[PDB]
């Protein structure tokens, strides 16, 4: 319905940043209220579009130090800060972005997508579990599970 | 040259190239290039060296101690530094790096407003002031102090430039990149990605300690093996500061600066863009390079080693293309110093436009 | 009443892109309906803030070639295409961005701010007239189009 | 003699030279290197235009001896101390000169515990600044210092302050005067994220306008602003955000003694005031102690300067201390004077009692 869009935008944005190895951190809300984490970033409440998402995570920019938060089908805020998980199952030298993703996935039902600035591989975080190096259709099926 | 050698001020960091020395460099250089305009616009860039941060801090402290407006750029190639200093009409530009040298070494390099190395008179005055044991230079205070405008987005400007110098996107070309763990690490992987090419990366993971560490133009054997591993169409090996370029054909053989010069100048002649159909080069070039240049009816002017003489000749005679066997290629149509990524884009232009593989294009020039 | 908060964001964004060399084209709706031109870009309906605008007009990026249109204190859309001005009288200075800005000022009452990609000078277009070389506080005082 | 009361201070470039800041960073990093051969010094500044120059020189110095440096950007000195403690970091540096004019600046040091460096360490740092031989180690290659900017620390120090509020301040109109200093971005986020109607002023720094007719030392602008916007109260922090001066709805100034009285009285009403005592300086007003007796709160007096206030709170394990300046220490939460913490405690009192600021401040008669 209106789920095919926004989902299409997320996958297109993620493939765009993956081909260019642009670090990204996008947290999709479902049932747990994350307003306390939204109020830490730059509020946008913008309609979701691939171009806007790409523009948010440009290498060095005011709207890049932090995570994008998606509430409903709108980018509620950008450059939001998430807690670090300090877990040993995070493959080291990565962290920072991945640590924040798994940390926010430990506390909430949120689905967190990550794009590595070092490798360009797409990662996903849910319930404290981080799956690295996902394919385009793996992310597509995961985002249709939402 | 006391402090200003061929590649500016160089030394092993902290021990030889001390942060105090970098501070004096920034202060005295900003003063000498201040004289006319009240508040110069020096912008500064570096490679990924662990000493880069310390030297940048000292340099910005110096530049602000005489009122110069400072535009930090972060990690960006020396070509990008020159391009931004010119395209922004800024009084001077600084690159803290020491191309292809080991991580322990570093260096400060200066560019004028035109995008070229500072005039020897200015460097002479800078060294004159570094001998007086009295810092009798003005010490602005309050609002007279220097100003700082971080411009870490500058890369994408220099990126948007390179992107437009491609005759078309390179769709269907598999290219391996060796960025020496240097300044081009973030840039190149972005650039060829925006030109629709399947990039395969290596030496694109810097950590301040691994620059030019068995990777880069000086150590292309890793890329030679990697190209055969990923069966890519070609491999590109930039160096630390991204001013050189060394190619690798699909067979895994090295394609030095002479072969790339031949290929690109031949393509430019095929487009009529080669000015007077001449190519500037150094003594270091191979005999077969000039042989094939004659075979394709391309005149050539030779200068002494070092790219300041190559650019001197291209300057006075208004020549389009110049280069060295090192891979340092100057295309004066687009930039004023050697540009690894620009040279790579020209090579990709030739590849795409002729459809031949890199080995076949490089085989036209026979080395002696 | 709290529109000064929004002017603060606009002035900071424009002075930021002007201090460097970042091209910008910001239109702002007033009384004429600009939906015909809004529906040509990427819809955002976002809260304003300077950072979003600066991010919008960054090189290489997708929705940066074109103009963002500001509606009721919200960035309605970006990368919108504006009509170019067939009027002569100015062309000598290249145009393109300035031409597109001036074109919308005859058809609308909108106040369009422009940042030159070559000079970095701030320009404004209103009622078909294009004011060149604006100072930081001249634009700020100029932006009192709000009552 | 470089380390006065407020660390090393001077007018920038002319007296507090970047060479001097470099020597400070290098020798202090050596002094704080003795444990691990890579200390974790983190560094922050206010909005002073000399902040960038002094920070560059300081980071160059700290990296010239191998110290790992964590830049923080613009953040209050309280935030610096809180972050250095909460991060188990060896030291923290603040480039600022509280409430002084923009032309002046200064370097201040905090140990791992969050307190001013021990006088032995400062003595050694000054000892090394006298030998005309920079015979200290010059690490090279991989032995050099490392820097990983941590501009997010602010939001940590913010996330801390946010939890020290007994509830959100809904329905309270508050005017903020941040002196165009470090508290400009923080405070406006804080009280807005705590659901309070904020009206801002002096929250627009440009590196030249710090402490310019605004802040705790110049509260008349905020005094007029409170009556203009008919706010319930106005809060005036200073340049580095360590002091606080309140303004009631009537427009009157509420100095540090009145704020100490109000907050200690509320804390006693919550039983959180340790031993029902309050530490203060000679500079405090007689009526402050009078009302302290009237509310059954004991009091300890120390010499002027906050090192003695915190000395007393240290040895005797006391909860609250302060000065008439507005420099208030709540040792339950922080180790130096904290403008925003004091403001949060005052807002706690306001919300919990519902009374206006004038009525709360009238209990203590000057």
CATH number at residue B48: 3.40.120.10
Q: Which chain A positions have a beta carbon within 8 Å of D193's beta carbon?
A: 39-40
- The tally of domains found in chain A comes to 1
Which three-class secondary structure string do you get for D91-120?
A: EEEEECCCCCCCCEEEEEEECCCCCECCHH
Determine which of D10, D13, D67, D74 to mutate to test the interface with B (most B C-beta atoms within 10 Å).
Answer: D13
Handedness of CA B219, B222, B225, B231 (dihedral sign): negative
Give the gap in angstroms from C-alpha A133 to the nearest C-alpha of chain D.
Answer: 26
DSSP D324-348: TTS-EEETTT-SS--HHHHHHHHHH
Q: Which helix (H) or strand (E) is D41 found in, with range?
A: strand D40-45
Residues 261-300 of D with CB under 8 A from B: none
Q: Which helix (H) or strand (E) is C50 found in, with range?
A: helix C50-56
Could you give the angle at the alpha carbon of B313 between the alpha carbons of B310 and B317, nearest 5°?
150
Neighbours of B5 (CB within 10 A): 11
Q: With CA atoms as reference, report the closest residue to D62 among D41, D81, D80, D77.
A: D41
D113 a known binding residue? no
Could you give the angle at the alpha carbon of D283 between the alpha carbons of D281 and D284, nearest 5°?
80
Q: Which chain A positions have a beta carbon within 8 Å of B194's beta carbon?
A: 20
Q: Which helix (H) or strand (E) is D163 found in, with range?
A: helix D153-163
Q: Any CB–CB contact under 8 A between B137 and chain D?
A: no
Give the gap in angstroms from C-alpha D210 to the nearest C-alpha of chain B.
Answer: 11
Query: Using CB atoms within 10 A of its CB, is residue D219 exposed (0-12), middle (13-18) or buried (19+)?
Result: buried
Q: Which chain D positions have a beta carbon within 8 Å of B19's beta carbon?
A: 22, 60-61, 63-64
Neighbours of B230 (CB within 10 A): 16
Which three-class secondary structure string do you get for chain B?
A: CCCCECCEEEEEECCCECHHHHHHHHHHHHHHCCCCCCCCEEEEEECCCHHHHHHHHHHHHHHHCCCCEEEEEEECCHHHHHHHHHHCCCCEEEEECCCCCCCCEEEEEEECCCCCECCHHHHHHHHHHCCCCCCCCCCCCHHHCCEECCCCCHHHHHHHHHHHCCCCCCCCCEEEEECCCCCHHHHHHHHHHHCCCEEEEECCCCCCCCCCCCCCCCCCHHHHHHHHHCCCCEEEEECCCCCCEEEEECCCCEECHHHHHHHHHHHHHHCCCCHHHEEEEECCCCHHHHHHHHHCCCEEEEECCCHHHHHHHHHHHCCCEEECCCCCEEECCCCCCCCHHHHHHHHHHHHHHHCCCHHHHHHCCCCC
Are the C-beta atoms of C66 and C25 separated by less than 8 Å? yes
| Cα D123 to Cα A85: distance, rounded to the nearest angstrom | 41
| Cα A2 to Cα A9: distance, rounded to the nearest angstrom | 12
Q: Which domain holds residue C39?
A: 1-147
| Cα B70 to Cα B150: distance, rounded to the nearest angstrom | 8
Q: Which domain holds residue D118?
A: 8-154
| Local structure of residue D7 (DSSP, 8 states) | B
A99, B14, B101, B150, D329 from B109: Cα distances, Å: 38, 17, 14, 20, 50
- Beta-bridge partners for D330: D320
Q: Which chain A positions have a beta carbon within 8 Å of B153's beta carbon?
A: 58-61
| Cα B256 to Cα B259: distance, rounded to the nearest angstrom | 6
| Local structure of residue D4 (DSSP, 8 states) | B
Q: With CA atoms as reference, report the closest residue to D244 among D146, D357, D145, D113.
A: D357
Q: Any CB–CB contact under 8 A between B74 and chain C?
A: no
φ/ψ of residue B345, rounded to 5: -65, -40
D232 a known binding residue? no
Q: Who among A47, A49, A61 is closest to C55 (CB)? A: A61
Resolution of the coordinates in A?
3.7
Q: Which helix (H) or strand (E) is A122 found in, with range?
A: strand A122-126
**How many CA atoms within 13 Å lie on the side-chain side of C13?**
27
Q: Which chain A positions have a beta carbon within 8 Å of D151's beta carbon?
A: 65
B257 φψ region: left (φ > 0), alpha (ψ -120 to 50), beta (else): alpha
| Cα B362 to Cα B357: distance, rounded to the nearest angstrom | 9
Q: Any CB–CB contact under 8 A between A54 and chain C?
A: yes
Does D184 qualify as catalytic in the annotation? no
Q: With CA atoms as reference, report the closest residue to C137 among C1, C12, C2.
A: C12
DSSP D247-260: EETTS-EE-HHHHH
| Local structure of residue D142 (DSSP, 8 states) | G
| Cα B129 to Cα B137: distance, rounded to the nearest angstrom | 9
| Cα C44 to Cα A46: distance, rounded to the nearest angstrom | 5
- Would you name the residues of B annotated as active-site residues? 99
Query: Using CB atoms within 10 A of its CB, is residue B209 exposed (0-12), middle (13-18) or buried (19+)?
Result: middle
Longest Cα–Cα distance of chain D, Å, equals: 66
Which residues does chain D break after (C to N > 2.5 Å)? none
Q: With CA atoms as reference, report the closest residue to B33 among B62, B54, B73, B10.
A: B62
| Local structure of residue D179 (DSSP, 8 states) | T
- Beta-bridge partners for D108: D94
Q: Which helix (H) or strand (E) is A126 found in, with range?
A: strand A122-126
Q: Any CB–CB contact under 8 A between B194 and chain C?
A: yes
B234, C55, D28, D106, D121 from D127: Cα distances, Å: 60, 50, 11, 20, 10
The angle, 0 to 180 degrees and rounded to 10, between the axes of the packed helices D339-353 and D256-269 is 60
φ/ψ of residue D273, rounded to 5: -75, 115
**How many CA atoms within 13 Å lie on the side-chain side of D25?**
36
- Beta-bridge partners for D277: D298
Q: Which helix (H) or strand (E) is D191 found in, with range?
A: helix D183-193
Q: Cβ contacts of residue C90 below 8 Å, gap of 6+?
A: C98, C99, C102, C130
The rounded Cα B186 to chain-centroid distance in angstroms is 15
Q: With CA atoms as reference, report the closest residue to C29 among C74, C85, C96, C83.
A: C74
Q: Which listed residue (D81, D96, D98, D216) is catalytic?
A: D98
Neighbours of B164 (CB within 10 A): 9
The angle, 0 to 180 degrees and rounded to 10, between the axes of the packed helices B50-64 and B19-32 is 40
| Cα C87 to Cα A70: distance, rounded to the nearest angstrom | 45
Q: Who among B152, B153, B189 is closest to A20 (CB)? A: B189
| Local structure of residue D141 (DSSP, 8 states) | G
Q: Any CB–CB contact under 8 A between B160 and chain A?
A: no
| Cα A74 to Cα C90: distance, rounded to the nearest angstrom | 42
| Cα D237 to Cα D256: distance, rounded to the nearest angstrom | 12
φ/ψ of residue B75, rounded to 5: -90, 120
| Chains in contact with B, where contact requires at least 3 CB pairs less than 8 Å apart | A, C, D
Size of interface A-D (CB pairs under 8 A): 10
β-bridge pairing A42-47 and A74-80: antiparallel
B153, D62, D248 from D85: Cα distances, Å: 34, 19, 34
| Cα C131 to Cα C113: distance, rounded to the nearest angstrom | 10
| Cα B305 to Cα A127: distance, rounded to the nearest angstrom | 62
Give the gap in angstroms from C-alpha B193 to the nearest C-alpha of chain A.
Answer: 5
Are the C-beta atoms of B175 and B348 separated by less than 8 Å? yes
**Interchain pair D140, B62: CB under 8 A:** no
**Interchain pair A65, D151: CB under 8 A:** yes
Neighbours of B142 (CB within 10 A): 16
Give the gap in angstroms from C-alpha B31 to the nearest C-alpha of chain A.
Answer: 30
A112, B237, D357 from A118: Cα distances, Å: 18, 18, 54
| Cα B319 to Cα D159: distance, rounded to the nearest angstrom | 61
Give the gap in angstroms from C-alpha B32 to the nearest C-alpha of chain D.
Answer: 18
């Amino acid at each position: 319905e209106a789920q095919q869009k926004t989902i299409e935008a997320i996958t297109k944005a993620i493939n765009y940043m993956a081909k260019r190895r642009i670090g990204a951190l996008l947290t999709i809300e479902r049932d747990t209220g994350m307003g306390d984490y939204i109020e830490t970033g730059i509020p946008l409440n913008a309609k979701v579009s691939s171009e806007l998402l790409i523009n948010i995570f440009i290498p060095n920019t005011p709207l890049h130090d932090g995570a994008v938060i998606m509430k409903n089908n709108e980018i509620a805020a950008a450059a939001c800060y998430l807690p670090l998980s300090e877990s040993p199952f995070i493959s080291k030298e990565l962290g920072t972005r991945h640590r924040a993703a798994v940390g926010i996935s430990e506390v909430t039902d949120s689905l967190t997508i990550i794009v590595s600035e070092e490798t360009g591989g797409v990662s996903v975080a849910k319930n404290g579990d981080l799956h690295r190096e996902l394919t385009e259709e793996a992310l597509k099926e995961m985002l249709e599970a939402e | 040259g006391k402090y200003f050698g061929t590649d500016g001020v160089r030394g092993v960091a902290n021990s030889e190239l001390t942060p105090e020395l970098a501070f004096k460099v920034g202060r005295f250089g900003g003063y000498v290039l201040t004289k006319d305009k009240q508040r110069p616009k020096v912008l500064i860039g570096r490679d990924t060296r662990i000493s880069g941060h310390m030297l940048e801090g000292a340099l910005v402290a110096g530049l602000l101690s005489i009122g110069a407006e400072v535009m930090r750029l972060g990690v960006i190639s020396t070509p990008g530094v020159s391009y931004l200093t010119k395209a922004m009409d800024a009084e001077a530009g600084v690159m803290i790096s020491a191309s292809h040298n080991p991580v322990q070494d570093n260096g400060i390099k200066f560019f004028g407003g035109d995008g070229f190395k500072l005039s020897d008179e200015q460097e002479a005055e800078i060294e004159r002031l570094m001998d007086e044991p009295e810092d009798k230079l003005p010490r602005p205070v309050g609002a007279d102090l220097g100003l700082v405008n971080d411009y870490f987005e500058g890369g994408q400007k220099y990126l948007q430039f390179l992107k437009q110098t491609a005759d078309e996107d390179f769709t269907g070309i598999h290219v391996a990149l060796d960025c020496a763990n240097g300044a081009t690490s973030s840039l190149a992987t972005h650039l060829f990605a925006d030109l629709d090419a399947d990039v395969s990366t290596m030496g694109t993971s810097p950590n301040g300690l691994n620059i030019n560490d068995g990777v880069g133009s000086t150590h292309p054997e890793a890329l030679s093996a990697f190209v055969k591993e990923k069966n890519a169409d070609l491999g590109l090996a930039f160096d630390g500061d991204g001013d050189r370029l060394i190619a690798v054909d699909e067979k895994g053989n090295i394609v030095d600066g002479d072969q790339i010069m031949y290929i690109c100048s031949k393509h430019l002649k095929s487009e009529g863009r080669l000015k007077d159909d001449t190519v500037v080069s150094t003594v270091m070039s191979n005999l077969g390079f000039y042989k094939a240049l004659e075979k394709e009816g391309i005149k050539s002017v030779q200068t002494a080693v070092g790219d300041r003489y190559v650019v001197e000749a291209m300057k006075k005679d208004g020549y389009n293309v110049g280069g060295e066997q090192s891979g340092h290629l100057i295309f004066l149509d687009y930039n004023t110093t050697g540009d690894g990524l620009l040279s790579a884009i020209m090579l990709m232009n030739t590849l795409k436009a002729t459809g031949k593989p890199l080995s076949e294009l490089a085989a036209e020039m026979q080395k002696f």
